[PDB]
Every structure is written in structure tokens, then in C-alpha cells.
Amino acid sequence: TLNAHLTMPYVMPGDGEVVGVGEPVAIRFDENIADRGAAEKAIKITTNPPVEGAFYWLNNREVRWRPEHFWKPGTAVDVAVNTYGVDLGEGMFGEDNVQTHFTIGDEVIATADDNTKILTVRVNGEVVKSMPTSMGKDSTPTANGIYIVGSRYKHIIMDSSTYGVPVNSPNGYRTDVDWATQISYSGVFVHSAPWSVGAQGHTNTSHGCLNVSPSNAQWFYDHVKRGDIVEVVNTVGGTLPGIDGLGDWNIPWDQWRAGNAK
Numbered sequence: 001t002l003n004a005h006l007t008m009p010y011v012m013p014g015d016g017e018v019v020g021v022g023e024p025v026a027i028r029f030d031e032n033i034a035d036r037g038a039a040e041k042a043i044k045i046t047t048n049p050p051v052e053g054a055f056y057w058l059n060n061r062e063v064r065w066r067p068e069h070f071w072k073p074g075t076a077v078d079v080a081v082n083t084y085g086v087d088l089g090e091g092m093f094g095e096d097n098v099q100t101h102f103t104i105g106d107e108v109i110a111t112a113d114d115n116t117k118i119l120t121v122r123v124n125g126e127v128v129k130s131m132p133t134s135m136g137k138d139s140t141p142t143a144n145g146i147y148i149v150g151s152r153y154k155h156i157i158m159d160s161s162t163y164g165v166p167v168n169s170p171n172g173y174r175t176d177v178d179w180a181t182q183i184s185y186s187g188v189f190v191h192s193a194p195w196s197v198g199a200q201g202h203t204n205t206s207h208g209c210l211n212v213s214p215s216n217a218q219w220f221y222d223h224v225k226r227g228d229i230v231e232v233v234n235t236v237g238g239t240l241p242g243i244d245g246l247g248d249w250n251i252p253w254d255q256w257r258a259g260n261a262k
Contacts, residue, residue: 001080006095007031007088009081013226018105021070022148023227024248025079032060034089036261039063042094044080051075054257058243068253070229071104073124108228110190110220112142112210114235117201119190119210121220129223131216132201134193136208140171141237143208146249147183149228152221156180160207163187173207179217183210183230185245190230192217204235 003015012026013019025045033039040055045065047053053067071077078101083094112119112133121129136142160172163186167174180191186208193200193211200211210230212220229249232240242251 001097001099004098004100005031005092007033007083007092008095009083009098011079011081011098011100013100013102015100015102017102018225019102020149020225020227020229021073021104021107021109022146022229022249023071023102023104024064024066024148025077026062026064027079027081028062029088030061031088031092033063034092035087036063038086038088039083040259040261042081042083042086044082046078046080048076055259055261056248056251056256057260058245058248064248066248066256068257070107070249071227073104073107075104077102077104104227105225108224109231110224110229111231111233113233114142114204117204119212119230121223129216129219131212131220134196134199134202134206134211135204135232135235136206136237137204138236140207141204142188142206142210142232142235143184143186143237143240144232144235145240145247147188147230147232147240148246148248149224149226149230150182150185150246151226152182152224153180154178154221158187158189158191158209160187171207178214179221181217181221181224183246184240186240188240190217190220 007029081098110121119131119133178192190210240247
């Protein structure tokens with residue numbers, strides 16, 4: 001048992017971490033898993049207060065577990081990945097066992113409504129921040145749906161080629177931003193956008209990201225943690241895919257619950 005041929009599992013979140021109410025347990029293997037039923041069997045999750053949940057695979061090497069609804073603040077979760085030498089199919093076995101313990105913090109849900117161009121942040125049901133925002137313009141719109149907060153960066157470059165769009169092309173970009181909080185693997189961030197403050201609250205001008213003001217982006221970066229929720233509604237976009245990496249809550253319970261072990 002470590003705390004967070006042969007496949008190593010890697011489990012998230014990390015040991016003792018405090019995460020938001022949208023955080024799934026993630027188990028990721030460094031090899032494709034032929035026998036998902038077996039991987040699932042080998043993973044034991046305990047919650048306090050107890051709550052029902054279920055596994056769903058986002059791809060061939062990574063499985064997720066979450067309840068039906070967002071976690072209750074204060075819940076404590078223990079994850080025991082008992083895979084050492086377990087038959088994982090096609091002559092691959094677990095390299096080791098792994099475990100983690102984490103807790104759920106405050107309920108933090110930020111809702112970006114394209115009808116108002118306001119991103120409103122709610123802590124335990126109390127509006128604590130209202131941020132004018134400027135989202136994806138019509139030709140490169142922001143997808144509707146529930147996004148899980150992922151990592152955060154004081155400064156990074158977002159480069160469109162990372163997502164299959166050349167920098168040189170009409171929808172391309174290579175952009176330095178401050179106070180960048182990632183909310184989808186497909187490239188959506190809430191981040192500082194001093195170049196669209198006139199538009200924020202009025203007009204969509206971005207490639208998909210939630211532009212807010214320098215001090216609202218910094219506030220968001222300071223007060224939000226991995227697992228918190230950004231709900232986007234009413235854009236002319238599609239829906240964020242359930243298998244994004246941070247889209248898990250867009251898969252309806254009945255479909256999630258049934259799983260996809262085979």
C-alpha cells in the first residue's frame with residue numbers, strides 16, 4: 001500500500017486534500033485495462049456520511065467514481081485500490097496497491113448565464129461574488145454544462161495547437177494569461193482578461209474561455225479549489241462532453257450508474 005507486464009494505478013485526489021463538491025475519485029492506470037470489471041472490483045471506496053456511487057470509464061486507462069449528486073460538505077472519503085497482482089486482462093496485472101484519504105470542503109458553485117453575462121459565485125447557497133464575464137463568441141462558443149475546477153496557474157500560455165487549432169488559423173491563439181483556473185480538458189479557463197473588460201457583461205468575444213477582470217480572476221483563483229463547480233447555461237453552444245476529463249457531471253445518473261465495464 002502506497003499513499004497518493006505490470007500497470008501502476010494513480011489515484012486522485014491526493015492524500016489529505018480538501019476538494020470541492022464536484023470532485024470525482026479518479027483512478028488512472030499507466031496501461032490500457034482489458035478487464036474493467038476486475039479493476040472496479042479491486043477498488044474500494046468508503047464515505048462518511050455513506051453515500052451511493054458508481055464507476056464510469058472516461059477512456060481505456062482511467063476510471064471515475066462519484067455519487068448521484070454533488071458531495072455533501074464535510075464528507076470524508078477513503079479509497080483503497082487493491083490491485084497488486086490482480087488479473088487485469090490480457091496478461092497485465094496491478095503493479096501495486098494504492099490508497100488515499102480526502103475531504104470535501106464548502107459547496108462552491110459559480111454560474112455563468114449567457115442571458116446576463118454575469119458569472120455569479122455561490123458559497124453554501126450565498127452569493128458572495130458577481131463577475132461580469134465575456135464568453136465564447138458565436139463562431140467559437142462556450143459549451144453549456146457543468147464543469148469541474150481542475151488546476152490553477154498564476155500565469156501560463158494558452159496555445160490553441162494543444163487542442164488541434166493552429167495558432168496561425170482564424171480561431172488560433174497563443175496567449176499569456178494571469179490568474180487562470182482550468183475547468184475543462186478541452187481548454188476552457190476562467191482567467192484574467194484586461195483586453196475584454198469593456199465587453200465583459202455585454203458581449204461574447206473569447207474563443208471559449210470565461211474572460212473576467214484582473215481582480216475578479218485573482219479573486220476566483222484565490223477562493224476556488226479543485227472539485228468546485230462552474231455551471232455554464234444559455235449559450236448558443238453545445239454541451240461539454242461527459243468524458244472531457246472535467247465533464248463527468250454531464251452524464252445523467254442512470255447512464256453513469258450503469259457504467260461501461262462491458
